[PDB]
Ligand binder design. Structure first.
Ligand SMILES: *CCC(=O)N1CC2(CCN(c3nc(N[C@H](CC(=O)NC)CC(C)C)nc(-c4cccc(N5CCOCC5)c4)n3)C2)C1
Ligand SMILES: Nc1nc2c(ncn2[C@@H]2O[C@H](COP(=O)(O)OP(=O)(O)O)[C@@H](O)[C@H]2O)c(=O)[nH]1
Ligand SMILES: [Ca+2]
Length: 170
């Protein structure tokens, strides 16, 4: 059989949301992607031996509110909380994303994965300890990734699917 999962990729401008998504769906790195393009993307993969259809919303745009975001916040089953390891404010922003997702779900138990992207870059400003401890406090996995090299990209998305599977079992 197969299973479909509705995923949402959130995080500050420029953390690599589109780059991660495109690495997953097209298997290569894109340097330039219009920051105003918010859209969902479908992709069939195989995760732990089961065919998995991913429906991924790559959040974007300058708008405070988006009908598409609203829809996926309601129906999305899992959320990728992305920050760039060289941008401290993007890490500080993670709290605000998690808080909003929890409120719309009216639940403290929403499948999420914390993603520290741009792990290839030398000049990091967010310590791995901070991120590990944050994820620890949230009770969620932390995966380090690089959309550029593709390091950890499948792990981030597949880990999120595994978290969804656990949540559906409850
Ligand atoms: C460069 C473009 C890009 O990739 N961007 C800009 C954004 C778009 C989504 N962003 C965002 N979104 C929210 N809230 C969303 C609300 C919504 O659309 N509901 C239907 C829901 C999220 C996506 C789960 N919030 C923020 C945000 C970030 C940091 C601080 C705040 N403040 C905190 C203080 O109180 C006011 C909100 C909000 N950003 C950015 C991704
Ligand atoms: N070095 C490096 N650059 C990245 C990585 N991921 C994204 N970028 C770059 O960061 C910028 C923003 O990426 P983008 O996918 O547009 O971020 P978004 O605004 O969160 O969708 C682009 O110039 C990308 O090429 C990464 O893992 N490593
Ligand atoms: Ca984007």
């Amino acid at each position: 059989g197969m299973t479909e999962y509705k995923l949402v990729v959130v995080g500050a401008c420029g953390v690599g949301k589109s780059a991660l998504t495109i690495q997953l769906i097209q298997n290569h790195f894109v340097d330039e992607y219009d920051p105003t393009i918010e859209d969902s993307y479908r992709k069939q993969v195989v995760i732990d031996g089961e065919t998995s259809l991913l429906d991924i919303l790559d959040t974007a745009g300058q708008e405070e509110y988006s009908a598409m975001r609203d829809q996926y916040m309601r129906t999305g089953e899992g959320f990728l909380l992305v920050f760039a390891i060289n941008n401290t404010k993007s890490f500080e922003d993670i709290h605000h994303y998690r808080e909003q997702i929890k409120r719309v779900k009216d639940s403290e138990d929403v499948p999420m994965v914390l993603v520290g992207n741009k792990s290839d870059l030398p000049s990091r400003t967010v310590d791995t300890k901070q991120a590990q401890d944050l994820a620890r406090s949230y009770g969620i996995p932390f995966i380090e990734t690089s959309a550029k090299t593709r390091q950890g990209v499948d792990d981030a998305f597949y880990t999120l699917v595994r978290e969804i599977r656990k949540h559906k079992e409850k």
